[PDB]
Structures are given as C-alpha cells and as structure tokens.
Amino acid sequence: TTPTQEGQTLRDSVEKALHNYFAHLEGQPVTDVYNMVLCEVEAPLLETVMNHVKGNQTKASELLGLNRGTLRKKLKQYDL
Amino acid sequence: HLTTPTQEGQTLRDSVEKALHNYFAHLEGQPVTDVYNMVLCEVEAPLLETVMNHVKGNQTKASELLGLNRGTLRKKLKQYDLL
C-alpha cells in the first residue's frame, strides 16, 4: 500500500552487474569471461540449492533437472 | 568512493544467493525442475547481449573475451535469440 520497489529479477541483476563491469575495465585483456561469470553464478546456485533440500543430493538433482553424476560432478568441483 | 547516501552494490554472486533464497522460499514443497537451464538461460542471455555490444556484433572478438570458439558462441548466441 506504501511506496515499494519492484525486485531486481535475476536477468536484470546480471545485465546491470555485467554492464558495470564493462565500465571499470575500459579496455584491458580479459579472457575466460564466460567461465568466470558462470563460476560466480554456479557456486552460489549449487550451494543455495543444497540448503533447501538439506544436502539430500537425490532431491538436489531433481530440482536442477540434472543427473546425480552430473550434479555431483559440478558439486565436486566446489565442495563435495 | 561514494561517501553519499548510497547502498552496497549486489555483487553478482550475492545476487544469485538472494534470488534463489527468494525463489525457493515461494516454492518450498512444489516439484520444480530445470532450474539449471532456467538459471543458466537467465545468465547466458544478458551475458551474451551485454558482451555482444561491447564490441558491436564482432562475434570474433566476442569469443576472444568470453573464451569460447566461434561455434560454441554461435549456437549459444542464437539459443537466446541473438543470431
């Protein structure tokens, strides 16, 4: 009923977070942007889902629509 | 820096934390699937377009920044409709 903002949607959070990163660079060699960015999304993504199902990795997999192996593969890339 | 009423900039990783805490809180219990594609497709989408403007359509230079080959970039570039 009072004044209230919208809610930075995940798509808009990236877009404006990236955009502000392509201004503090202003021309300098930067490679592996996809792997760097995916990493900073894939870690929090992976470990936030592991809370909600309390680490039950069988239920973690059904959420992301992944496979247990594929899940535990990326899972093992961060923290067992 | 900003010594003027200004908040702390959501570092991208933090932004992923909050949007999923918030996401899952409103779905605690409902069978949700394909969150990996769904999040990925919501990160790759801006990521491609945002870079695809830093160098103005030059896909060759897009792959030199992103770090993909002109064939993973391309088939991805059009997954999120940027051919």
UniProtKB/Swiss-Prot annotation, chain B:
<keyword id="KW-0238">DNA-binding</keyword>
<dbReference type="GO" id="GO:0043565">
    <property type="term" value="F:sequence-specific DNA binding"/>
</dbReference>
<dbReference type="GO" id="GO:0006355">
    <property type="term" value="P:regulation of DNA-templated transcription"/>
</dbReference>
<protein>
    <recommendedName>
        <fullName>Putative Fis-like DNA-binding protein</fullName>
    </recommendedName>
</protein>
<feature type="DNA-binding region" description="H-T-H motif">
    <location>
        <begin position="59"/>
        <end position="78"/>
    </location>
</feature>
<comment type="similarity">
    <text>Belongs to the transcriptional regulatory Fis family.</text>
</comment>
